[PDB]
């Protein structure tokens, strides 16, 4: 109910909405490992000047995390990168924000 910001806990998507697993070429920068197609569980969204999604993932020791994978406008068309990674989390740590 507040302008362009913190949403509510969103459950999950249908069979198609595959922003969850675009991690394979975009963790390569700093979160690179054998961690490919990381296991996301719950989702959320945000709005600024385009689309700003959120994904809660699992990675490593089945250790969970959050992902600021932010989409945007269609200058070309589709684009999204993790504008922040944090891998010290759990399922309880969900998708707080910021």
């Amino acid at each position: 109910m507040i302008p362009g910001g913190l949403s509510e806990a969103k459950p999950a998507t249908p069979e198609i909405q595959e922003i969850v697993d675009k991690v394979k070429p975009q963790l390569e920068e700093k979160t690179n490992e054998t961690y490919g197609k990381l296991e996301a569980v719950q989702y959320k969204t945000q709005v600024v000047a385009g689309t700003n999604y959120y994904i809660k993932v699992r990675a490593g020791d089945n250790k969970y995390m959050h992902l600021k994978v932010f989409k945007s406008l269609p200058g070309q068309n589709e684009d999204l990168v993790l504008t922040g990674y944090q891998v010290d989390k759990n399922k309880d740590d969900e998708l707080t924000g910021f």
């Binding site: 109910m1 362009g4 910021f98």
Partner: protein, 241 residues
């Protein structure tokens, strides 16, 4: 802390209203569109935009204030990931002012700080105001544009030229500014009648060259409560006087 109860006495209580068309973009009030990229600051953008308009109408000063200032110095507001439009005017009334877009920058999705000593220019308000869910056109003109909100969706963002007779978002999750109203003359594909297609000229805090320079106009009426996509709802306007 102040409302409409005694603000139309100084403009249009004892007067008449063109219930059709008035773009405040065309009468020395609307300031250049500014972008926010990937860090939710729409609220802060509309705050500085409205104060820009107030100065621009009175002494006609094309000064532009900053938006990251109210992303780091947001006391009772949240920040660069959400925030309310009305409790930013109050933080602005107590602090003292916002620094110009040069004297203080915006870096979008990036950590930044706040100093209220990176300026020497006294830019502040004295009172703010709320406008009802219907007088968005009636109070757009003699009082000035209104920091409003709109239901953001992929439909709302289809940025072509036209009146937005389409669907909307599922929650009131984006702040914008109401900058005018108008009317268009189109015809029916059966009996070629000049369908009166009035609208609201609505700005976008995205600052993009979205459709009409960053101003998607949306289907509204001669009165002002049919407003789709929640065009209004949380409508706020500051006053330097």
């Amino acid at each position: 802390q102040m409302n409409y109860e005694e603000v139309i006495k100084k403009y249009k209580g004892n007067e008449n209203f063109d219930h059709a068309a008035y773009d405040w973009r065309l009468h020395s009030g609307v300031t250049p569109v500014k972008d926010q990229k990937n860090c939710g600051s729409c609220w802060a953008f509309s705050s500085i935009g409205s104060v820009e308009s107030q100065y621009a109408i009175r002494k006609n000063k094309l000064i532009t204030l900053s938006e990251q200032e109210l992303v780091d110095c947001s006391f009772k507001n949240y920040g660069c990931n959400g925030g309310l439009i009305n409790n930013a005017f109050e933080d602005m009334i107590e602090l003292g002012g916002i620094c110009t877009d040069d004297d203080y920058p915006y870096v979008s999705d990036a950590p930044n700080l706040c100093n209220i000593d990176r300026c020497t220019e006294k830019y502040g308000i004295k009172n703010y105001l709320s406008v009802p869910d219907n007088k968005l056109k009636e109070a757009l003109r003699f009082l000035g544009p209104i920091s409003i909100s709109v239901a953001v969706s992929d439909d709302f963002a289809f940025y072509k030229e036209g009146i937005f007779d389409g669907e909307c978002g599922d929650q009131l999750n984006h702040a914008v500014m109401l900058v005018g109203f108008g009317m268009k003359e189109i015809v029916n594909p059966l009996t070629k009648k000049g369908e009166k297609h009035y609208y609201y000229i609505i700005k976008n805090s995205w600052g993009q060259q979205w459709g009409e320079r960053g101003f998607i106009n949306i289907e509204t009426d001669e009165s002002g409560l049919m407003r789709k996509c929640g065009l209004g709802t949380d409508a706020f306007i500051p006053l330097i006087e």
